[PDB]
């Protein structure tokens, strides 16, 4: 009144007595209820959210007086949809506050009087936990009423006779309620329980109002849709239900994914729909997102879902296994050609083009084939683990390039391509007989061992050499002239095969060389200790995920649109490219 | 398991390393005069079993390449060591029962 | 009898029992149905041989495997034509071997299989 805080305090306490009669000076001063005096400088918070913020067991009876006062002031529109101006909040209209307090009593009254239902809480606080905001709910009261597990209000807020919000209404990221409802989904049992419950509630509701298209069709700015978003964000709880979405109601049955084709006594053949799991490369697919993405948290169990594990195995049986064996054998023969070609590469020095013999022609063919596969690899590398593959392509190209010029002393790259070629060969051999644990062990020890050791390796070179010059001005290592490299090799053999002469061929030098020994030995023991604990027996899952990589890697290779497609399905009333799965149950 | 994992690497490096070797020499350290690779094979047989390899110090790529076979050979043995320990399974107390019967 | 390869000899009795409705099965049997029907079809071979369900290839065995105690009781105790439990099939399984062909290590599956398996022996022995 005289000062804003007393008005805020009066409404907060819920005392309508002193609130009465304030309208007198409002009319006398012709001051609108939304004037600057009623709004904070920074937040601009209005009496409505302040009154609603202190909800007293649903007994905040000061709201209708303000609503009545607002009507008297002649400015009721802006009063209801009062937007904050902060960065830590924004557009948080009174509707947002009312719903969030989990009190539909005033929400319906607020909506009935007319409130901006399409309010957009486009604030920093409202962004995902990764982007600095503490709570993301779709940035809509309908989505806010959805995420917060408020079934009655979402029912009313979309079934209210007054203005209502369409569930398709998008947001800054285009999430809509469905994507947002997946943005709050958690692997916890209770969280997934209401999310999947209410998520189904929304689709059934949206379908009935708008039978033309299901709500999942609308794509977020990233372009995912709920199932993909649950797939990309690793929400196993929701995801494992979405694929198994069966709706009994015929009018809303079409928006299902797990049909029931037939049963022969105790054997059931559920006809899963996978219109999204495999687009034949026409559009992004859940399966590609689920394996070719690292941010996924629950990959191992997500693949376990029914029409995913079987789907990958189906590709394995046809056009996934034969093309794998065609790859190992064809590629292995390519390297063997490279190995033999390098070995018999024209001797006698200066081999620009010495091919004037029958066997020479065979060698020429070997070089040509390796040259061809060298550049063929280049196209498939640029077209898109390919690192080693990319290095192979350029190096073999580099080799033939120098050879074609007839320039000597540049078989170095050619041979170094070979070792990489067989290092590249680790990929295919991994996918069979549960191999590749060698590969995982190699990389994990690769980075570690080198700079732990080389740190100690050079640590002692200078440390031990400097102690050495005490006896000698540089004999045992280098008679005359000051080098330390021969000392380096001395240590290289001290542990590898021993046989170190040292200066017996003064005691500190003996003590110091003892440290490098014991330090070197235990580091090897610790390295041995690290490796044994790091094996983990493959966890039985890395192969599964890694194996699935091969099948999909092959599929994207050749044109999928050809007759390499999973099973088809009926035309209408149930033209969806469904897939069949059969499970036997005696219950 | 062990035989063709190793012999694959064993002969993989013979030709790979010999071909890099002929850069310095038309075939000395392994075979003075005349072109053989078998003596190189034995050279690797002792490089890990008991070391004592003369190499051509008795150019750098040959030094780098022979480093790969070493580290590749060592970890494969470690992986073989890793495979065996996990494969023991303490007999599961059942294989003997079935085998005894 | 059907003439497919994916089905064969699947007389109306097979369908009636499989739907787990003895109401029409008894009516069908009473009117006179070929109880010794032989579902000698591809679908009916074991899961290893391409068929999804093997049950002995007999309505009596089909009524046995599918955990249908009342129908197997009637189908062998019905005053009209009845099937002898010893009646063999393509593989000579009879109900007992077939009843073991659907047996599973699962607790519930073994529960009725062993239950009904005993039921058959007691019944066969008395006759
Ligand atoms: C049926 C094919 C047309 C399918 C396609 N082509 C090949 O695989 C080959 C082409 C050639 C040419 C000359 C010599 C040998 C080969 S092998 C294909 O499959 N993809 C295309 C992209 N990819 C590639 O370009 C390499 C294939 O060698 N990637 S790789 O790391 O080297 C690899 C090799 C074998 C296998 Cl088991 C799995 C993999 Cl990860 C991978 C997947």
UniProtKB/Swiss-Prot annotation, chain B:
Description of the deletion phenotype = Knockout mice display impairment of the intercellular junction-dependent barrier function in the skin. Increased energy expenditure and improved insulin sensitivity in white adipose tissues is also observed. They also display reduced Ca2+ entry and loss of regulatory volume decrease in response to hypotonicity in acinar cells. The voluntary water intake normally induced by sodium concentration increase in body fluid is impaired.
Q: Where are the transmembrane segments?
A: 1-25, 59-85
Query: Which cysteine pairs are covalently linked by disulfides here?
Result: none
Tissue expression per record: Detected in liver, kidney, heart, brain cortex, cerebellum and brainstem (at protein level). Expressed in salivary glands (at protein level). Expressed in heart, lung, spleen, liver, kidney, brain, skeletal muscle and testis. In the central nervous system, expressed in the lamina terminalis (arched vascular organ and neurons of the subfornical organ), median preoptic area, ventral hippocampal commissure, and ependymal cells of the choroid plexus. In the cochlea, expressed in both inner and outer hair cells, and in marginal cells of the cochlear stria vascularis.
Motif Selectivity filter mapped to chain:
49-52
Name the source's superkingdom: Eukaryota
Q: Which residues lie within the membrane without crossing it?
A: 36-55
**Where in or outside the cell is it found?**
Cell membrane; Apical cell membrane; Cell junction, Adherens junction; Cell projection, Cilium
Query: What does the PTM comment state?
Result: N-glycosylated.
Report residues binding Ca(2+): 52
UniProt record similarity statement: Belongs to the transient receptor (TC 1.A.4) family. TrpV subfamily. TRPV4 sub-subfamily.
Q: What does this protein do?
A: Non-selective calcium permeant cation channel involved in osmotic sensitivity and mechanosensitivity. Activation by exposure to hypotonicity within the physiological range exhibits an outward rectification. Also activated by heat, low pH, citrate and phorbol esters. Increase of intracellular Ca(2+) potentiates currents. Channel activity seems to be regulated by a calmodulin-dependent mechanism with a negative feedback mechanism. Acts as a regulator of intracellular Ca(2+) in synoviocytes.
Quaternary state and interactors? Homotetramer. Interacts with calmodulin. Interacts with CTNNB1. The TRPV4 and CTNNB1 complex can interact with CDH1. Part of a complex containing MLC1, AQP4, HEPACAM and ATP1B1. Interacts with MAP7 and Src family Tyr protein kinases LYN, SRC, FYN, HCK, LCK and YES. Interacts with PACSIN1, PACSIN2 and PACSIN3 (via SH3 domain). Interacts with ITPR3. Interacts with AQP5; the interaction is probably indirect and regulates TRPV4 activation by hypotonicity. Interacts with ANO1. Interacts (via C-terminus) with PKD2 (via C-terminus).
> What does the entry note on its domains?
The ANK repeat region mediates interaction with Ca(2+)-calmodulin and ATP binding. The ANK repeat region mediates interaction with phosphatidylinositol-4,5-bisphosphate and related phosphatidylinositides.
User: What is the protein's given name?
Assistant: Transient receptor potential cation channel subfamily V member 4
**Gene symbol of the encoding locus:** Trpv4
Measured against the full-length protein, the chain present covers 612 to 738 of 871
């Amino acid at each position: 009144v005289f000062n804003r805080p007393i008005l805020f305090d009066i409404v907060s306490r819920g005392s309508t007595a002193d609130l009465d009669g304030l309208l007198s000076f409002l009319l006398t001063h012709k001051k609108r209820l939304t004037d600057e005096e009623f709004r904070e400088p920074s937040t601009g918070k209005t009496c409505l959210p302040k009154a609603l913020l202190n909800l007293s067991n649903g007994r905040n009876d000061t709201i209708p007086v303000l609503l009545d006062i607002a009507e008297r002031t002649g400015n009721m529109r802006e009063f209801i949809n009062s937007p904050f101006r902060d960065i830590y909040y924004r557009g948080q209209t009174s509707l947002h506050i009312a719903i969030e307090r989990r009190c539909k009593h005033y929400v319906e009254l607020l909506v009935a009087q007319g409130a901006d239902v399409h309010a957009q809480a486009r604030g920093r606080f409202f962004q995902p936990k990764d982007e600095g905001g503490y709570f993301y709910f779709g940035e809509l009261p309908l989505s806010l009423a959805a995420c917060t597990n408020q079934p009655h209000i979402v029912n009313y807020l979309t079934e209210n006779p007054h203005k209502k919000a369409d569930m398709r209404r998008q947001d800054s990221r285009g999430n809509t309620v469905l994507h947002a409802l997946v943005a709050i989904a958690d692997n916890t049992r209770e969280n997934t329980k209401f999310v999947t419950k209410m998520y189904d509630l929304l689709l059934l509701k949206c379908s009935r109002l708008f039978p033309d298209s299901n709500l999942e069709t609308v794509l977020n700015n990233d372009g995912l849709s709920p199932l993909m978003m649950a797939a990309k964000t690793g929400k196993i709880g929701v995801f494992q239900h979405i694929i198994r979405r069966e709706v009994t109601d015929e009018d809303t049955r079409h928006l299902s994914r797990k049909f029931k084709d037939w049963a022969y006594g105790p054997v059931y053949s559920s006809l899963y729909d996978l219109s999204s799991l495999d687009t034949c490369g026409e559009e992004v697919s859940v399966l590609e997102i689920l394996v070719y993405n690292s941010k996924i948290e629950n990959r191992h169990e997500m693949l376990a879902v029914e029409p995913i594990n079987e789907l990958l195995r189906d590709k394995w049986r046809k056009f996934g296994a034969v093309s794998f064996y065609i790859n190992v054998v064809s590629y292995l023969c390519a390297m063997v050609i490279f190995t033999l070609t390098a070995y018999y590469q024209p001797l006698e020095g200066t081999p620009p083009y010495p091919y004037r013999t029958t066997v020479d022609y065979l060698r020429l063919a070997g070089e040509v084939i390796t040259l061809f596969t060298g550049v063929l690899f280049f196209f498939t590398s640029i077209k898109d683990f390919q690192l080693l593959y990319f290095i192979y392509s350029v190096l073999v190209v580099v080799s033939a390039a120098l050879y074609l010029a007839g320039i000597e002393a540049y078989l170095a790259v050619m041979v170094f391509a070979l070792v990489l070629g067989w290092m590249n060969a680790l990929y295919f051999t991994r996918g069979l007989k549960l191999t590749g644990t060698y590969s995982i062990m190699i990389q994990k020890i690769l980075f570690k061992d080198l700079f732990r050791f080389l740190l100690v390796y050079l640590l002692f070179m200078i440390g031990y050499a400097s102690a050495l010059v005490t006896l000698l001005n540089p004999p045992a290592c280098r008679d005359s002239e000051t080098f330390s490299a021969f000392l380096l090799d001395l240590f290289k053999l001290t542990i590898g095969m021993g046989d170190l002469e040292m200066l017996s061929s003064i005691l500190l030098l003996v003590t110091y060389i003892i440290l490098t020994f014991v330090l070197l030995l235990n580091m090897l023991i610790a390295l041995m200790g690290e490796t044994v604990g790091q094996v983990s027996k493959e966890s039985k899952h890395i192969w599964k995920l890694q194996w699935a990589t091969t099948i999909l890697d092959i599929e994207r290779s050749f044109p999928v649109f050809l007759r390499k497609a999973f099973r088809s399905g009926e035309m209408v009333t149930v033209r969806r490219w469904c897939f069949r799965v059969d499970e036997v149950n005696w219950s």
